[PDB]
Design a protein around this ligand. Structure first.
Ligand SMILES: CN(C)c1ccc(S(=O)(=O)N2CCN(S(=O)(=O)c3ccc(O)c(O)c3)CC2)c2nonc12
Ligand SMILES: CN(C)c1ccc(S(=O)(=O)N2CCN(S(=O)(=O)c3ccc(O)c(O)c3)CC2)c2nonc12
Ligand SMILES: O=P(O)(O)OC[C@H]1O[C@](O)(COP(=O)(O)O)[C@@H](O)[C@@H]1O
Ligand SMILES: O=P(O)(O)OC[C@H]1O[C@](O)(COP(=O)(O)O)[C@@H](O)[C@@H]1O
Ligand SMILES: O=P(O)(O)OC[C@H]1O[C@](O)(COP(=O)(O)O)[C@@H](O)[C@@H]1O
Ligand SMILES: O=P(O)(O)OC[C@H]1O[C@](O)(COP(=O)(O)O)[C@@H](O)[C@@H]1O
Ligand SMILES: O=C([O-])C(=O)[O-]
Ligand SMILES: O=C([O-])C(=O)[O-]
Ligand SMILES: O=C([O-])C(=O)[O-]
Ligand SMILES: O=C([O-])C(=O)[O-]
Ligand SMILES: [K+]
Ligand SMILES: [K+]
Ligand SMILES: [K+]
Ligand SMILES: [K+]
Ligand SMILES: [Mg+2]
Ligand SMILES: [Mg+2]
Ligand SMILES: [Mg+2]
Ligand SMILES: [Mg+2]
Lengths: 425, 427, 436, 423
């Protein structure tokens, strides 16, 4: 229908140049796709109550950040318990349950050369409390990431380490840091004090670009909606900043004081949700997909090969979604690196993977709770139907839509190799 | 994992270039072709190429389609030619490394002075149906109704025969779109075309028709005087080798030999020359731009076969896949893969002898006729044909242990349900 | 590398490390982003003009001199506040600060004066106060009118009529502040000299989360049309009270420049804030960084692909001159202009080279600040008897002022754009000159 | 009607595939033929009357094959060419200069320059030849030996290196660096390397020469069958069209004109095909790729050339009129493959003959009286290019032209591009 092609900036998406794409952007072309950039909300006195946390989950919070620069272990354990209580209050409806990751943001090295003794204690607390992600403060070199990894020990091998780049050395040694990290956070607060303020946008754009090229999550952080700490509406520079972080290629956008101590924590989440949805429809996928395809090296890994074939197939038919079965989240991450317009619905039995895939733009995790079927092919089909039923309930899919389904040839992580075109009935 | 030698062969330095100009600059006469020859060779059967022994040599040299020119000879003469082709083809049933299907094409005499289908073309088309020909090269197609007349003449039994319309005059060129729409493919019949329009304009008609056929995903044949001097000489001129290479680089699915094989002194050598040039020219194709342009020009599709095909070709390029193995009954799944011009060979596994012969019209499709009895469990039968394609691939040199192959199948039996693409590691 | 090797040996590796030149040579936009370097220092003069709103914090002659030195190019008078007497005093103080630097072209900086109207209010068209204020603008020789709440072409015809026969030279920049203005954008741009994305009202008239779409669409259409576009409101809002902006504010200024804005504006930051000079310095610092980060390879190709073929020799010369400037990494394009139009056509192709515009019109020298990358030089030397000698003298004046100001160096290549006969509209010549 | 001719619908296409789809056999070529025709002079084309017909048919360069015939035979050929060329000097606005190229016998089994090549090269200098087609060039030192044998009097002669064997192809870059241009000598090349690989060598060499901005000639068996038949084969017309589409500056005729029964018809056939093939060139991609690949430059002639070609495409300029002493300014314009004709106005007779090596350069030998004021003299040569262009069909009143001149007399000072309206 004609109406389909008038929505989600589809006239601007069909443009032959980026300049023409900009000219065709329409404030009346409503976004239809689900919001794909994750919202990280920092937990504090304004967002700690179980009832307030339920409102924030409904508004769109995907990751709960615990800032270990403030508060004791007792304070953070209570925050964790309140987050988990608010998250599990929706578990009664498995088709609409939304997993929420828990990220521990470290205090940092301070004047010392490497890992502080408080960071070692806080990291062990994170492992003991089952945190999903570590936002490692002031990472300056690859050995800083290795020290964080060693402090997590053998039980914390599954925790994702997102390195915070906050100073000149971190920016200069970026490639070596990204190589050993699971992702990056552009920590603009400290970065804007360590380097000239007028240069922070160059560091942000460079880091987002390099993370997109590497296929690793990148978080844009600090003062995105600062004025909303005390005011109900953000400034014109703030909405522009959020939209441009998404247009730059950020996987995640963050709220610090806006949710930790502000008067509008839920409204700050709703604002980031609204801007991100508008900005994602304004992404010029024609150039972005071509450039990601061109920049990506040849690969003999079947997951990587299946992912690009599936994204190409999704664009060919305007698939509403790519439904992927994943154990670690990796198959969903490799799909996400090609920035499909289709939602990546990731069906998993791992509660930790369902939480961690929020780091990857466009990945919508579904936690499947049923015990495995005796016949593995039936177990596989049941999970794909779970992804379809949740997708229909949430508005991702309708009858008549085409979906791309991504599976593997045997159970266990690392064997994704199949892509199939499916019609929604 | 593959080695530096792998990336020096088959013009891979030129293939990785960022511009077409740089691609040309990187072409290397020392970069040897490794991939199997993907552009089919059509050889016209005549007095110089009719004997069963000569036909065996032509099959070994690379002939994929045997052309019977109904402008010369009687039905009895052509039936004997057909029987000799089939005898030469079946002489390799004892060697899997050599049994290759060969299509039989009937080239019509034409309408002559008359308006539509001639009495003789009607009788000759009937002969083709009765003798089980795979393809009709319809002479002097001028409009869509000419194709409908040929199609109507393919009686109740011959609706599966492919109609390749020969464009040989100004009207055929001008009404090209309407002709291509109702035809299975096109032949740029340069002999008559070069007499009907100014000779210096034929290259424009050839390039335009090949481009439109590539955009439509329909077979296009480049024909006439490609290696003309080889009718009396053992080596072609510099213009002739250039012409064969440029037909492949233009986007032709097939290249043809007429007098060179029908009446010449070197029919086998003419086939060998076309084989050698096509292999070199296929490695020199600038896939980076070709794939992007085919992708961009092709419209969005809700047909799972079309969606699977582009996903599979994208996957093949990503891993330098040795091959795309496709299960096909009509050949359609192999044809949709072929339209995206993959560098990987498209190994088409079919139980249909006719589809095996007819897929020679599509560039890069290597048919394998499968004759094992069907399995009770369908998924087992699918696995069996996939493994058959892998093992013939290994036997013929297409594949080795450790290679990656893309596999295209459907979710249920019967034609029309292709929707699956898998990445398999060769064990 | 081979496409920049001889010039790398000639100019040196240090030349190609500065002004984001490694990012500028990238083959894709993604690679361009990856190559952005915080240590790659900007070298070129700031090309995006800064409009500063004059008010109690920025009205004194001494403060205005500091703002001109900080980088203010256009002084905005907001007619929503203050009397005609108040604005006439503001104008006189701006002119006094401007003329305090008039001893030489090396120190002189023309500053345009823009009148921002109160607006229609609840009424359908031009208010009686707007008619009076527009007549005040003509009488006080304002260069630009920022017309508030333009909703259709007839609104700009009414502003043009209220300016009368004496105000035909005044540039009308239409402020788009509501849904109707955005929807009827093409008809408004057609009859306007330029556009202002007035984000303050726009953010209240349409959903706040959609303002960035309106800004990017309007900047893109203005760039395609070759008309000035101003990005306005809350760019450095926090600097009204604080000496440093927030991370969203520096990002907003940089992104307005990267979007393609010709001008960036300061309202409360300079009119009533505690740090008006620091707000100007911050915009100057960010614009210089953002201009070097522009991906000229794609921008120039897209401006060429989107622009229709032209039989206007000024338009043909402009693209040839910009192409020539990119081929040799020209330090400047020196153009002779009566109305500013030849400099504007050069500016639409977004050259990396500075466009030094030599003119005798004081008004054109002020108004060309609306065009990104145009540096106006007001020529006051006595005329030559022979027209060809007079042209050559103005070209040499451009080169001398360029050299003494740091824009040009001995050894540089400069592109010179002139016409074949006197009078506006005859530009048709492009010359490649080596600086000695 | 303007946009229906010269494949302009195909020229406006957004992809090369769409460009091919839009090629129209009814879209007539209107631009003058840009690719020069080199015709080999022999028994079938030696008479002054025959040579006049070949000049009218389109011959731009006369090739003397020193593998056959004596010095007396070649001197007579040269004199007959010059007599046929000067028979048209009565109409200066339509006079066509014709270059004379000497094709050497070659080294044979020898390591360097043979004694016959030294004698033949000295003959060329003494008879004022414009170009040397140096046979079997295998390395840069082979070009240096040819250059030394030409001596101080043969400084101005262009050396076009013939690549005819494996070594020449492998050492191509070093050969091109010291040569004025290249000839893809397909006859010997097709015997020295496998025949099925010659097209790879041709396309690589044409591409590298286009990148370097140096003339490249496609040679041998282009219309071979026309030695005995009045019409060529379908492979032959395709070969001529593809050499032009590949980017060749010149196309050659050997036996077709030297000994064949239809030398004039062979020239007419190459002219007709080249005109059709030049209109089918996809300039949108070609200009962008040549523009992207041409390195950054601080040479004002180079900078003016790109500005002028960009300006010509922006206004659909009928021509770029350039003033040149050595031909260099016209060559730098030619390397960007403008659709506009490059009308090169020169006082040098040798430069007018030699610029035939550069595709799209139409030489005008200026023989009008000088003007006292240099500025007036320049403007007069510009009007001469405009009137010659008007007479020859190139230009009409109302057209736009780009004019490329310098700031002072003498070679090497081009730095000005101007947009001029015709009449
Ligand atoms: C995530 N990441 C790598 C990307 C972001 C945005 C894009 S994008 O949104 O497609 N876009 C961005 C800006 N331009 S531009 O060349 O600077 C230009 C061109 C014309 C103008 O008028 C203008 O103001 C600026 C490049 C393309 C991408 N494409 O590929 N990758 C893209
Ligand atoms: C199969 N069939 C449809 C096609 C053939 C070749 C190609 S192609 O190989 O990608 N194609 C070759 C011709 N050039 S060009 O513009 O003539 C050019 C440009 C720059 C130069 O320096 C030059 O000498 C020539 C465009 C690129 C195709 N692409 O899409 N479809 C293609
Ligand atoms: O993305 P990951 O972590 O590699 O997991 C993908 C895996 O999920 C599957 O699709 C299903 O596996 P399970 O039955 O063990 O859940 C596997 O075939 C595949 O290897
Ligand atoms: O190319 P075609 O004619 O559509 O055939 C493709 C068909 O082949 C298959 O892959 C295998 O089917 P069969 O077992 O019936 O041969 C189908 O699942 C698919 O529909
Ligand atoms: O940019 P504008 O307004 O068209 O003015 C450009 C004009 O300036 C000139 O270069 C010099 O003209 P003047 O001598 O009148 O100042 C003209 O040749 C040209 O037409
Ligand atoms: O192309 P070339 O050999 O460098 O010659 C270009 C030269 O021609 C001119 O335009 C005219 O010079 P002359 O008056 O000597 O003929 C010079 O200004 C310029 O330097
Ligand atoms: O730590 C942070 O998030 C910062 O400094 O921006
Ligand atoms: O019939 C043919 O093949 C022809 O005419 O070229
Ligand atoms: O009027 C203004 O400048 C605005 O609303 O931004
Ligand atoms: O000498 C030649 O021209 C050849 O060998 O082709
Ligand atoms: K912290
Ligand atoms: K026939
Ligand atoms: K106002
Ligand atoms: K010779
Ligand atoms: Mg910090
Ligand atoms: Mg025929
Ligand atoms: Mg307002
Ligand atoms: Mg030879």
């Amino acid at each position: 229908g004609t109406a389909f092609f008038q929505q989600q900036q589809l006239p601007a998406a069909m443009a032959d140049t980026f300049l023409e794409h900009l000219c065709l952007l329409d404030i009346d072309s409503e976004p239809v796709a689900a919001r794909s950039t994750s919202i990280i909300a920092t937990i504090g006195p304004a967002s700690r109550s179980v009832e307030r946390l339920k409102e924030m989950i409904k508004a769109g919070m995907n990751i709960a950040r615990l800032n270990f620069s403030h508060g004791s272990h007792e304070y953070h354990a209570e925050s964790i318990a309140n987050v988990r209580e608010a998250v599990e209050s929706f578990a009664g409806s498995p088709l609409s349950y939304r997993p929420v990751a828990i990220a521990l943001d470290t205090k940092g090295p301070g004047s010392g050369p490497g890992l502080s003794e408080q960071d070692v204690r806080d990291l062990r607390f994170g492992v003991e409390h089952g945190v999903d992600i570590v936002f490692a403060s002031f990472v300056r070199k690859a050995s800083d990431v290795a020290a964080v990894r060693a402090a997590l020990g053998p039980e914390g091998h599954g925790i994702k380490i997102i390195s915070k780049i906050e100073n000149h050395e971190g920016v200069k040694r970026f490639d070596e840091i990204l190589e050993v990290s699971d992702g990056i956070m552009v920590a603009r607060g400290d970065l804007g004090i360590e380097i000239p303020a007028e240069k922070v946008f160059l560091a942000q754009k460079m880091m987002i670009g390099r993370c997109n090229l590497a296929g690793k999550p990148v978080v844009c952080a600090t003062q995105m909606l600062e004025s909303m700490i005390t005011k109900p509406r953000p400034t014109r520079a703030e909405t522009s900043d959020v939209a441009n972080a998404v247009l730059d290629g950020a996987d995640c956008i963050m709220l610090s004081g806006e949710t930790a101590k502000g008067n509008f924590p839920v409204e700050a989440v709703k604002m980031q949700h609204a801007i991100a949805r508008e900005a994602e429809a304004a992404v010029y996928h024609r150039q972005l997909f071509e450039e990601l395809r061109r920049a990506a090296p040849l690969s003999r890994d079947p997951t990587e090969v299946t992912a690009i074939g599936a994204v190409e197939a999704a664009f060919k038919c305007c698939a509403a979604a790519i439904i992927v079965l994943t154990t670690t989240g990796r198959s969903a991450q490799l799909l996400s690196r090609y920035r499909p317009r289709a939602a990546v619905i990731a069906v998993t039995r791992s509660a930790q993977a369902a939480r961690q895939v929020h780091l990857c733009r466009g990945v919508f995790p579904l936690l499947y709770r049923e015990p495995p079927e005796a016949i593995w092919a039936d177990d596989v089909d049941r999970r794909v139907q779970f992804g379809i039923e949740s997708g229909k309930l949430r508005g991702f899919l309708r009858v008549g839509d085409l979906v791309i389904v991504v599976t593997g040839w045997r159970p266990g992580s690392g064997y994704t190799n199949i892509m199939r075109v499916l019609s929604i009935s």
